[PDB]
Design a protein around this ligand. Sequence first.
Ligand SMILES: CC1=C(C/C=C(\C)CCC[C@H](C)CCC[C@H](C)CCCC(C)C)C(=O)c2ccccc2C1=O
Ligand code: SF4
Lengths: 60, 143, 122, 33, 163, 741, 41, 80
Amino acid sequence: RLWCVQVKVLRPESYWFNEVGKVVSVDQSGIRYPVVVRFPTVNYAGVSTNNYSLEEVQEV
Amino acid sequence: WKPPTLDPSTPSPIFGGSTGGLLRKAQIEEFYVITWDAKKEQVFEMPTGGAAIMRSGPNLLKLARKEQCLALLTQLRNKFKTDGQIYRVFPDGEVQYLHPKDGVYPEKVNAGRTAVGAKDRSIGKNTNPVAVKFTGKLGTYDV
Amino acid sequence: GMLETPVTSSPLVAGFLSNLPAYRIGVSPLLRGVEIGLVHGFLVTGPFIKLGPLRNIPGVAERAGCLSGAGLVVILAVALTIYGASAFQDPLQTADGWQKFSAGWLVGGLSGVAWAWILTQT
Amino acid sequence: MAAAYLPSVLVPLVGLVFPAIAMASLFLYIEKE
Amino acid sequence: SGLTPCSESKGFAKRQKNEIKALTKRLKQYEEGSAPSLALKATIERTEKRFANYGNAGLLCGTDGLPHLISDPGLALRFGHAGETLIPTVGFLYIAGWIGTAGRDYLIASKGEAKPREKEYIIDVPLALKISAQGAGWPFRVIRELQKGTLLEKDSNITVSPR
Amino acid sequence: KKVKIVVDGNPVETSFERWAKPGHFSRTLSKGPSTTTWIWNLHADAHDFDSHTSDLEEISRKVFSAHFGQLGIILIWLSGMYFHGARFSNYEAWLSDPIHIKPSAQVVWPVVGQEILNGDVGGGFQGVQITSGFFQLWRASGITSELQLYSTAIGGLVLAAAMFFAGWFHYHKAAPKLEWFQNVESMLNHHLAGLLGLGSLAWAGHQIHVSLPINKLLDAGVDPKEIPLPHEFILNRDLMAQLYPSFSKGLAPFFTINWSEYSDFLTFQGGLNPVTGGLWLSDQAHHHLAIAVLFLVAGHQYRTNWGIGHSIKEILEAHKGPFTGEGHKGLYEILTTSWHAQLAINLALFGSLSIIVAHHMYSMPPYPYLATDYGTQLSIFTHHTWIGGFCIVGAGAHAAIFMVRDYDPTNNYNNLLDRVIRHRDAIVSHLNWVCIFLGFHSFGLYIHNDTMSALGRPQDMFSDTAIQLQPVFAQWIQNTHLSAPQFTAPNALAPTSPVWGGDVVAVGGKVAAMPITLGTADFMVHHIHAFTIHVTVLILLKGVLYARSSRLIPDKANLGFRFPCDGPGRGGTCQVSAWDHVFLGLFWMYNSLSIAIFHFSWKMQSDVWGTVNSTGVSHITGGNFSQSANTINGWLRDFLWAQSSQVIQSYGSALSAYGLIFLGAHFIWAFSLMFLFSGRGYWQELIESIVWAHNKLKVAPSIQPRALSITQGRAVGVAHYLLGGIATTWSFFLARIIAVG
Amino acid sequence: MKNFTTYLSTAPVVALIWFTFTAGLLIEINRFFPDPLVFSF
Amino acid sequence: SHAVKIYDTCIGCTQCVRACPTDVLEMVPWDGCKASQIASAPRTEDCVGCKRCESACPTDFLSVRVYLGSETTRSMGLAY
Ligand SMILES: CC1=C(C/C=C(\C)CCC[C@H](C)CCC[C@H](C)CCCC(C)C)C(=O)c2ccccc2C1=O
Ligand code: SF4
């Protein structure tokens, strides 16, 4: 929820499930997936960022 | 904005013909027509193979598939900066206007469009296939 | 649009194709089948006679080849009959027209086989 | 063997006559609208 | 297993005699002191030494006259065949644990750098040589990490697919 | 306008900075890896210069310096071949006795028991028997000592270092500009008159002054140590005139146009030397002199700087007709701006040339004692056939690359290229029908014969003693070429080859060459060749013609030359790219050339090669080609099962390496099928499980492991398939022909 | 010299040096001690 | 015809619409994401099933999903 805070992804279909990423930004306009997370590894599409909801990320 | 009508008297590009054009499906099932207004006379690549010369002003090309028309329209928009209109023509003479459907290109968000196929959940929230057995549905994405 | 060539768009080529029984101006489909069957069923006995398994036996070779040609004609008549029942569910491109065409093919093919046998016997 | 004429009838029937009728009828069935 | 020692096996001696005979048959076409003659004589000497060493090692020979290895640690220890499979097993396991521990230590050291992927294809050769020399004492460190619980990543920190 | 030297001074700094940065040449790859795909992408894109930059000048400079590097590598390889002949060979002993001594120039070290491969090749020497034919080539050149082979090895390494210097120099110091490379008229003039013409003239000079007298003394029976050195023939004109009396007249007959005085060493004999079984060296000297004059004339065609000469653009633009639209207009701009179109043309002609070379070298053997060395003959035929087929597939590949990347419809309106694209459906459909007809009426003949033989009806077979298919046109051509010295070439003493007819040329009791009669089996196998070549052409031409678009994918050019598919839609679009057409054409070229080399091996073992005794000629397989090559079972039994006995019983001998390579190549071919039959989704999921195991023990790499890409999976599959099959045939051929030859 | 030593530290060059050393060690062991089948002296 | 569904993880980047070769997809106004637009699939009868849209989608997992269904002339990409 903070800036540049380690979070653990709880989305099961995510490539980075049970992995730790860095929060880039949290949108405050009430969108469905406001937490932007940067990961040190790429997924199968070569993407390093994904958007998650509040319940899908756990601060670590 | 209103859907444009197809003018069948529009001149065709200067083309010597090819073996890649229309087949029996055009006469009995459907075919497609792309129209565009060229700024100048220049050579473009046919989606069915070969080089054709588009005439200055309006142009009309009959193509077998919608994908061929959209590939030609992508070439016209990217290379010649020319917009175009795509129609579907049925053997009875009925003409269905296709692209751009509301006059705005689909990549640009336009008011008055309604979302179809939208699901109010992430893709991991789909149910199990055992939950849709003997229901007649296509799959867990259909419920 | 469509590519036109001297092979596809000659006056001589279109003249030769129009005189074929499949493209003549006014001919009943049974008669078109009759000429097509006569020509084809005359031709098919040749390979059967000259190259069949009994080709080295005098007398039996021509009879066996003509019987094989007649069997091929009957099989092709069956294939034409079941083609028409499926393709049709130009008077030739109709169900009854193709039925008459198949009957004419069978009659002409048997006649051509018999004529080939007579010619080999004379 | 007894009834030795039977292969000379049944083998052409099972090998040629029955498959021809079978493919003709199945072709008419799968092309039916 | 019904085998006989190779030092008293008739098939073993027959095979040695046949191989020496074939090499001597090849030897008689060359003059003495030439390079092919010297090479064939060296091959003959190596053949004789190899058959003598295999006979002296206590190897068991089958009916084919060929040595058969014993790999059960019981039968190897009580009948003097531990040098066939058991001692090679210990040697291989030591070297394999050495290689694996050196690779693991290099990967863990490269994980802490600013560009962890850079060290995987451009090798830190001094670091790799230092870590490689430290792999001799791998069983002590590995067994300690196993007892401490630091050898294994926790299941909560490892990605899995949906079930 | 004016042909001149134009370079740029010091364009690229010579430094090791980019050596430390893999992927530096590519914009995408320079950022470093994230996954293991970057490792393969770096090697796959390393030589695609046109992908690195769009500047044609930089591409041309890279191509020029890479060609210098290739020439340096080739010279290193050649110098090593000459060095191994000088140091690790039995070449001098073989010179003293070329019939009973097997050539060998590879010696293995005694370790792990591998010294058994040093076989008793003769000459008091042990080593690996070689089949490259270097000994016969060196003997034909007049080389009589290891010192002369040492000199060529040292001189080759000096020239190899000069080639590597020139590649560094012409890229880093003085790189020519684009207009220098586009002087195709000057390049053609220099490469015809100066490369080929002066090369043929210089080699005619070597043949006349060195090869002719030394080989004349060798065939006269003189010991090689007693033969005078070549410079003795250069300096002492009387020693030359002792063998060729026209040398006493000097150069006066040449300048007074009394050329018929030189008839003793400039001959038109034809046929083979009966002593050696090779072509007459005087014939080859006259051949190379005539070729030199022809190429020196040919190199004065194109206009460069002195008004006279042809402009290639004018010739191309003037050659148009009523059926062909604008004709050859725009081809000059294609062939001066696209390296890929030039590579396609040159690869096609070079590969065809290699295959023609294989046929002409077996039929008219140009080296002494080459023809009776059956291992060398089989090896060089098979090798040059394979090189030709690979180059032709590459021609198809780079034609497709030109079509995807360098084709411009604006510059090609109603010319030959445009009109070919505009009837590609007719071309492909007609070629498809031709391939189906050829497959039926060639392979079905074999199936008919196998069924007839298996049904106990050999009288219903297609054979010489049954229903005959005589190749009458080829028989007429053979009879015409046999009768050529009578009427149509009266100044030729003999036909060009003994294969047309006539007598048996025997050297040392073994057949050098003999008539090759053609019957029903030859007819059937020749139509098999026609069918397989037509199918390979169909695949490669379909790939070229549909590289940019088809009715299935109208924007295929936007997807590139090399892409896996366009998804499972439209029924499924796997392998639509032109690259995948190259991928399938590799298999079909392998099939075609495998049948070609099998036909060569069986026919020469059955009807040509053998021992000439007092009664006649006893062939290696005793003439069983005409009896059994008309069935698939005959091929499988009498060729494959019978002739592989040498490679499967080669264990315990010097040929046991061939048995090991036979097994390992079967393995490699089988190993290829896992890449070809499977797909990368399975392997990626299996890698996910393995990565989990590595993550558990904290040994997961930072460079993330990925399965190979779909295109890489196809490339690996076809590469291992080709390697396994070709090396299987290689070991089988070499073991068979060394043991029985 | 730093860039040249970095190139020598790349994975294929390091693999070539290491496998040359390992293959040479195995070859020279089998040369000095020919035909080792068992751990017996 | 193939079924194309859009899930609410869509960030409205319009890449799937630009990748589509048969004009199946379009952007409609939305409020669930920052770009204030979501992808929609009103013309799935023209979907060939190439899955270029899924290749273009940056979300993890995909926001646009194509399920291949019953095949017609348009979905098989037939010009004949
Ligand atoms: C087997 C197989 C794989 C799996 C194969 C892979 C991943 C290649 C593995 C190659 C090497 C062995 C991986 C490791 C490379 C390292 C550079 C080696 C380091 C080890 C040291 C000893 C040097 C695919 O990915 C695939 C993809 C598409 C179609 C078919 C297939 C297929 O058949
Ligand atoms: S199977 Fe592979 S190659 Fe074929 S369409 Fe699917 S992804 Fe593409």
